[PDB]
């Protein structure tokens, strides 16, 4: 027919190849180095996570005898809830203040898509023409909602304050920092204010506030760098959670200049303006104070999982070794 | 009643006047034929409905357009490859009349009724009518080795009127002849017609019609008038109907695509039910989940059912078909490239001319082979002979045995001898030269006279035109041994006896016929004595020997030795005729010749009168040379558990000889014929009016003629129901034969039509549900090549009839070793490895949405980025599995020929069942549980919580997609056994490509251009910088793969496969003895156990020399 095929390794189907064989001496080592490397990691994660100082206060007050059930039915919409908690052990270094919501499906598909990123990106066209996705919250009466969406509308609007109850019994306020709680990319890339002008008043012209919001997006904060679409608390909320039970960074309690602990052990009071209702759908609001760890945060599951997987790998290796020896 | 000597074409008006004679349909083809392509078009519609859409239309078009584009690209090269196949090999040209003179024309520029012209060794382009020819009386000799298996030449005659008026070219052009004949039929043994010319009617018969598969032999030129052309030729009518061949796994994959569809509907319906329930006691109380749409909870569940069809759509693959056919396309090129299947003698490589039937080569159960031209070279050589009880042919020197290593005999002392005779025996030469044993001289004088061959001396080269290759072998052999047939005349022959020019007067040639099994010649010596010389079968000749035959016992022993060596044997004899005895017989002989009323039987009666007391000269032995490696190939494919059946159109004697030479029939086998087979089948009928037909331990073979094949298979209102018994009675008989024939070690069907060949193949496909391979050459094998699951066409010859209709095409039968044991065996392993992993990586990827449903309110929120689902099946997991399906090798090609037992794995369909399919779905299901619930455990707690905390859905999505890509690309490395550089590059390149593209999508630069499409800006940078995110990804991959490694090791340690055992002792294997024929099986106790007689020849040649028809 045609000429002779050319003698190449690929076409003659003899490419230089490594032939791995799952021999007794090739798989058993990987079942022991994994076992001997995963166990120490699990010990490190487990012990380090346990060393993290954390307190979690559930201020939802859904069950009676919690001293702010009065805020489940706030006849006067200013409702203030006060809870006394004690830090048996002092907190050292930077401490992070979080608020947690349980049974809050912020990953619902109808919810996740209810936003206009082109609007949050500071696009002039998308400011006055919110997308169809944020449909129920596009326009309030005649002009469009500036942060359109079910996500922006349902923003966490509780206010949390911490006071240190000293020996004098006078509550000492604790400084809370609301800056640098969001992703740098979210602050400086994803979220931008509408272009032009120098005052947010004129920039957000011809747009309503979200129906659930008390005040417009103009004055989310007094700082010109923390109001508008670039507000830290707003951007933290906009970052939807992966699971129904989550927590979102609220404030940074910076390390004190003095050598004393940032949150010395003693009596504390949590003064929260109850604004966010979650008890309708069996939700739970929480306040979490946690100290910084150079191994991320407190993840005992990863510590235990590495011990379990590492332990089983060693156990499998011994079982495989016995089986191989019998069938040698 | 059934006749063992004929091909039963019976059990299976036209008018001729002389000289008066690309992308739109392919996309649609792959859409409708494939249910999955319409499935992905339906999803596009469901993805464009905002009420139900859960994934962007990008998520399906991008994979679909790539899949559609790649399929179109493959279909183009197949279209171009097929065009090249047809064009480059259909370059056949014949001379036709369309102007005042002949001119070269293609075989396609042939109309019904145009005068043509052929030369020596020309294939006949169409069924023609002999009008004139070079040799006298407008004869024409044609070999029909392509129309049937017959290896001898047949003479054809023209009309006595066309012979004497259409000799010149000028009159052929003006020939205005009108022919009425039957409509195109398949039956090649007669032709009913009439030629109306010169105001006269001339009836026609098949002796005047040259058929398409014929080849002109020993004729300088012959002119014919085309009667039929193209598909109207009787040989094309015998070609079957082309069918669209599909593999055993092609049907399987359709069932599996329907199984994943059913699973997808059921999972979506359950998840839709859960959402309807979730929206009742949770979703309706959630103020933040208010969409201003008065949708009832059950309507939301109905409305999300289409959402989960979209989300879980990747369960059914979008690249399964392209991946399967891209793998087969590459696997088909390894056949075209194999240098071990390349025949350098004819410059013919193997050709995978169908790129769609590849893994089926690794599943063959039965091989149905042709004989003439497929198992043989169409060469016959004189090997041995017994003279006066002394066997000649062994390696000998001088007058006594000295050593085995003997040089070729020197024939320089002979003037006419040439090198065609490779004889290693010098003792015979002294007997011829010395002359002390004149019967040795007399033995080879017989071979130079008892033939009926013709001699060509037009230029002094003394070429022999033998119609029987046996005669050509014997006449050539005697020519080398000093007895050369020089010239022939109507009455005389001019044999030269060692240079002595002696002219004998032929008084009678007792022609050959199949039932006669011998021929004789009576010649008058120059002295004046009359001698009768006869050669033929040992059985017939031993019935006509003189009482005093001292060499009878010794000659019988030699015939047994020749028979045990798989050679074709003839017995030589003669007698002295007295002058008074001959004239008495001659008077009766002449009467039977002139008497035309019963000439055939009249001549036979007088033949027996003179062949009464014959003195035995000796015996000959002729080898019908097989193709090299044929017995080796049959022994190895028998170790692969493949049964080889020989279906040939050649005579029973030739078929049985090649069966013994091929080692298919040994001296252990007991051979059953149609007479015996029919009796056994009958006994099964009255017995039932299943017990094994034979004892299990015996060795048996069937030699079945076409007449007996029809006899045993019954293929020789009241009408309505009466047919059901006739059809049901046949169907029971059809099944009984298949069970009988499949109970035999070997089966040979001889004298069968092209339809019968396909019929036998079809019976095994039906009643055994077996995968069948048919290999052959010539147009009589096209029917079974098209019928079989795989059809191989022996290429490299000059006629390409079986090549065009075949799936594969190599030149040598021995290349069937590598086609099945190497290429098919690997192709099956590689196809099943691909399917085992391909359905793993699609379930592991898609079932993550299923587990995330239990934490997002059953809202069909994807667990991945929108653009990860777009590129997963085309970028992140496409290349590595393709490279495995093209490069995997469990053992070496040389080590897979050494162990044909590895082939049985694919015959039993062990590497991919419905069970192996569901085990890979369970593998993907369990992988998706870990790919989700390990990240979920980490994310349920603190995962790097600071300002840049990746505890959100996007970080969750990136983490699971990262672990999935590493896991499914590390699984394909555990599956791979042949780790090439490209295999390593694809596995790590696929993981590297995912990270490279992901960081490009999650970038500030692209977000500014269009924020709407890309929502994951900055997620990869934040998520993959955290130690817990990488500690979570590492843990997920380890838990996904460590159990797999333990299972693979335990399975290999406790239940190692045949490949595993060979690899363990690969370096400790050194004993591989080459195949050897059974050199000696001689025994004592029976004078005759089997007759090795075989002689391909026909009637009518003696009558040509007897008259002046063939003498010029
Ligand atoms: C650790 C306990 C195993 C739990 C699974 C229970 C075991 C199970 O159902 O099957 C395991 C599945 C299937 O995935 P696999 O393909 O890895 O399992 C097959 C494996 O390929 C064997 O080796 P091999 O022939 O492929 O070289 C095969 O041997 P053989 O062909 O001779 O029979 C056998 O077939 P068989 O089962 O006999 O039909 C299966 O065990 O996935 C896994 O390999 C691990 C999945 C789990 C991974 C995540 C961990 C939960
Ligand atoms: C903090 O956020 C909650 C919701 O996350 C706010 O409660 C919501 O307040 C809006 C009004 O601003 C209510 O919308 C509509 O108000 C009209 C009065 O014009 C009322 O008649 C309707 O019932 C309608 O809902 C919305 O229902 C209400 N939602 C809930 C769950 O209470 C709250 O006002 C916010 N507080 C601050 C200080 O930002
Ligand atoms: C919490 O502290 C406040 C002020 O210190 C006090 O009035 C209130 O009774 C305390 N409640 C409980 C439950 O200790
Ligand atoms: C709690 O905070 C509110 C608002 O900042 C303030 O008016 C009140 O005095 C604080 N202390 C309480 C409620 O005990
Ligand atoms: Mg043939």
Residue numbers in the entry:
A (entry chain B): 24 to 351
B (entry chain A): 16 to 27, 63 to 71, 106 to 773, 787 to 813, 833 to 1228
Sentences from the paper on this structure:
Lipid flippases actively transport lipids from the exoplasmic leaflet to the cytosolic leaflet of cellular membranes thereby creating and maintaining an asymmetric lipid distribution between the two leaflets. Most eukaryotic lipid flippases belong to the P4-ATPases subfamily of the P-type ATPase superfamily (with the sole known exception of ABCA4). The P-type ATPases share a common architecture with three cytosolic domains that are involved in the autocatalyzed ATP hydrolysis: the nucleotide-binding (N) domain binds ATP, the phosphorylation (P) domain contains a conserved aspartate residue, which is phosphorylated during the transport cycle, and the actuator (A) domain contains a conserved glutamate, which is responsible for the subsequent dephosphorylation of the phosphoenzyme intermediate, that enables the protein to return to its initial state5.
Upon data processing two different conformations were observed. In this conformation, TM1 and TM2 are tightly packed to the rest of the transmembrane helix bundle, thus masking the substrate recognition PISL motif of TM4 and closing the exoplasmic lipid entry. To identify the phosphoinositide binding site in ATP8B1 we therefore determined the cryo-EM structures of the two full-length E2Pautoinhibited states and the E2Pactive state in the presence of PI(3,4,5)P3, for which ATP8B1 has a higher apparent affinity. The observed density is weaker compared to the surrounding protein, potentially indicating partial occupancy of the phosphoinositide binding site and/or flexibility of the ligand. In our experimental conditions (4 °C in LMNG/CHS/PI(3,4,5)P3 mixed micelles), the closed conformation seems to be favored, but the equilibrium could be poised toward the open conformation in a native membrane. Thus, our data indicate that the E2Pautoinhibited state of ATP8B1 explores both open and closed conformations, but only the open state can initiate lipid binding.
